[PDB]
């Protein structure tokens, strides 16, 4: 039991919880975001997670091959999942690059973000303590913006390529390449440290957050709803899609994981444990983040909603401020960023390995015919690194925000989840799926899962998509920068690169099948033996 939970401890916490969830919560007014977060949690998240794991166990193959045994017509779902993973692996590693840059900067007598007396610092800076002793700027925020990021005025101004950040990305990608090539993973005595270190560090960060002299206001802003925020589609899509992204569902990684697990395990209980603790850790780390933000508000004399960036940089603004106020700040900064690097590296290894396995299974005749697999891994790492160079430039933050919003999140996950649940519930048949689950684990899904798949998840996904289309608002970096039309088109292109996979595969298989149209459709709807 303990060993199984420890093996879980590798995968039930990640950057999606520590980093992504807090900034999405902060961006969408805090407490207002929780309502659709929990609604989508119990409506779709756990059932779709269980459904994908069941698919993976039932087929015992990759996320693309299983749909052949389920519904050949909708085989494009696996292709959409693999392209989603491919896009995610490009921009997810930039977080580790920023973490590596912060870790290297932490090897100093004094943390650079503690005070603003350097060459990169604006003359409007004022210390947080003395800011309340105009348009002053906190040293941490502008350290993030100017030193680590060197933020460009817009996406239309890429600027120069930051050599230090490029080297950080190269280091992280080299680590990933060597780990994947040599199959390096936490399996010995080191798994205990690898799993326990994030929660020890998070517990320390949370305890520091709550004990601040202004944590109460931050917690109140974190938990108190604002029902006028639920009238805008953005809080619904962000909260619903965060559930899918955190669980790594709709990516096809879970389908492959289901084929690489020990047998005779109670699948239903394991899925609920994974989901419940994955959501719990996000909700728990929200207290730490928002308590830090509340103390920052009390110190700087500004509103809680304006203290820090409303974007991916929230984790790189709040946490350094927290570690700045602990005894021997350098030690805790080093520990925090090593923790972040390990926590993101394990997930990156998992996703890269899954992508490699999915791609080689598509062409085993050449890719898997011999030692060419290592060359393929090197090719994938190299192409991903070159693609990630675009988000290292001075204007790379806008590209990162666009990628995070569209390429591996947003409407695409809703599309994939809706097609998965619709196919299984209606085309394949909910009764047949329940019969399969009975044969596999011994008991049927129950009314909750069956009705979720049949009604709740499709209704939620379609409602969110239609609500977004009807009440469309453009994406904005932070809350003041408006993206140009071409940038929005590029983001929609990134999303459509995954969404279009299903119709393209459908029409291709319809054209590549003999017989009349009805005969073609019948032959492709009937599951294979």
């Amino acid at each position, epitope marked *: 039991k303990i060993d199984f939970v420890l093996s879980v401890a590798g995968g039930f916490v990640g950057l999606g919880n520590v980093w992504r969830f807090p900034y999405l919560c902060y961006k969408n007014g805090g407490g207002a975001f929780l309502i659709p977060y929990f609604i989508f949690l119990f409506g779709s998240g756990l059932p779709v997670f269980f459904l994908e794991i069941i698919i993976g166990q039932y087929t015992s193959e990759g996320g693309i091959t299983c749909w052949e045994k389920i519904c050949p017509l909708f085989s494009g779902i696996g292709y959409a999942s693999v392209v989603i993973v491919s896009l995610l692996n490009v921009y997810y590693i930039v977080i580790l690059a920023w973490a590596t840059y912060y870790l290297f900067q932490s090897f100093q007598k004094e943390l650079p973000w503690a005070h603003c007396n350097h060459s990169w610092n604006t003359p409007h800076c004022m210390e947080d303590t003395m800011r309340k002793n105009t348009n002053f700027t906190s040293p941490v925020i502008e350290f993030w913006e100017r030193n680590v990021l060197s933020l460009s005025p817009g996406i239309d101004h890429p600027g120069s390529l930051k050599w230090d950040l490029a080297l950080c990305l190269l280091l992280v990608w080299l680590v990933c390449f060597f780990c994947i090539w040599k199959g390096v993973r936490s399996t010995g005595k080191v798994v205990y440290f690898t799993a326990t270190f994030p929660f020890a560090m998070l517990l320390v960060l949370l305890v520091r957050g709550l004990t601040l002299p202004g944590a109460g206001a931050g917690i109140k802003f974190y938990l108190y709803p604002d029902i006028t925020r639920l009238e805008d589609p953005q809080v619904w899509i962000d909260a619903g899609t965060q559930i899918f992204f955190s669980y790594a569902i709709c990516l096809g990684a879970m389908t492959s994981l289901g084929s690489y697990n020990k047998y005779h395990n109670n699948v239903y209980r394991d899925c609920m444990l994974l989901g419940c603790l994955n959501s719990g850790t996000s909700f728990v780390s929200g207290f730490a983040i928002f308590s830090i933000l509340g103390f920052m508000a009390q110190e700087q004399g500004v509103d809680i909603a304006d203290v820090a960036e409303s974007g991916p940089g929230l984790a790189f603004i709040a946490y350094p401020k927290a570690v700045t106020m602990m005894p021997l700040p350098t030690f805790w900064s080093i520990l925090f960023f090593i923790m972040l690097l390990l926590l993101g590296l394990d997930s990156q290894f998992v996703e890269v390995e899954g992508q490699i396995t999915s791609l080689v299974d598509l062409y085993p005749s050449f890719l898997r015919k011999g030692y060419r697999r290592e060359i393929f891994i090197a090719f994938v790492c190299s192409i991903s690194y070159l693609l990630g160079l675009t988000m290292v430039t001075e204007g790379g933050m806008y590209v990162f925000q666009l990628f995070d919003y569209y390429a591996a999140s947003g409407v695409c996950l809703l599309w994939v989840a809706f097609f998965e649940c619709f196919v299984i519930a209606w085309i394949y048949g909910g009764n047949r799926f329940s019969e399969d689950i*009975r044969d596999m684990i011994g008991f*049927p899904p129950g009314p909750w899962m069956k009705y979720s798949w049949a009604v709740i998840t499709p209704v939620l996904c379609v409602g969110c998509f239609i609500f977004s289309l009807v009440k469309y608002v453009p994406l904005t970096y932070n809350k003041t920068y408006v993206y140009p039309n071409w940038a929005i088109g590029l983001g929609w292109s990134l999303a459509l690169s995954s969404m279009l996979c299903v119709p393209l595969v459908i029409v291709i298989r319809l054209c590549q099948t003999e017989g009349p149209f009805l005969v073609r459709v019948k032959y492709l709807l009937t599951p294979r033996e």
Partner: antibody
Amino acid sequence: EVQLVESGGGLVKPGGSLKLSCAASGFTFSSYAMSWVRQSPEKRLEWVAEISSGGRYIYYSDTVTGRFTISRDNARNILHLEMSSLRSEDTAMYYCARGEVRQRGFDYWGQGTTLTVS
Amino acid sequence: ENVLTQSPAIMSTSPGEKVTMTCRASSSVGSSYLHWYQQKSGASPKLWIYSTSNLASGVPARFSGSGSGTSYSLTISSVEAEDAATYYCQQFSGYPLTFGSGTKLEM
């Protein structure tokens, strides 16, 4: 579930054939898997075969793997067991049981019919 | 085939005295996949305990079960006159399904 009743038992000869039936009522027959359990005159229970809710998966005991055929009629809510080459050791009482949940076991059992091969 | 064997085939008993009977399995049987059935004389068997600890609807709290892995047992706190029946252990973990030899409480 309330009622499970078997029927069709009788006297046969070695090498003969017989078809056993089990009518079900009080519950959705199509949603629950069914199994046959055999009780020899020595009172020893032996499992015969299992049919899933939809009948897509069918399981048999080693002794009747190539001899007995289990079938169900969801529309008629009736369970059938078919014997092709009954041997001398097959004389026993057959009960149809509901085995939908493998972790809960056979919730209800039928009255049963005695089978003899004298 | 996973053969299940129950040692106390015949057990004379008097009212009030506690009684425990054990089921032994030749292969690893999961805790949730073992169940006991009660069969009165001249009657079809009825479910008694499932998942090795959960009591069926009709069985009173008088009965309880325990065991894990390869040895299982269920005990009676204070046997009554109505407790005289045959109990069979059954494994549901893997096919073919098998039942125990059975213990007939004669009193």
